[PDB]
């Protein structure tokens, strides 16, 4: 009725602070590991060159 309640009350602030920091850490990780991926596609010049070769030119 008296002791354990008081010590729980004393614990509350530190735990709240640490959990807030942990959540911030996880969202920070979410944004950190995002990168824009630029894909590379076969240049159409080679396609045009192959078309010319097929024509026997």
């Amino acid at each position: 009725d008296i002791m354990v309640p008081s010590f729980v009350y004393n614990k509350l602030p530190v735990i709240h602070f640490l959990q807030e920091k942990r959540a911030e850490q996880k969202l920070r990780r979410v944004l950190d590991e995002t990168y824009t991926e630029w894909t590379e596609e076969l240049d159409q010049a080679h396609v045009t060159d192959a078309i010319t070769r097929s024509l026997n030119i």
Binding site: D43, Q44, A45, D49, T52
Partner: peptide, 10 residues
């Protein structure tokens, strides 16, 4: 310009 490389090869 689009065919610059191809034309140069020719």
């Amino acid at each position: 310009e689009v065919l610059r490389k191809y034309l140069d090869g020719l």
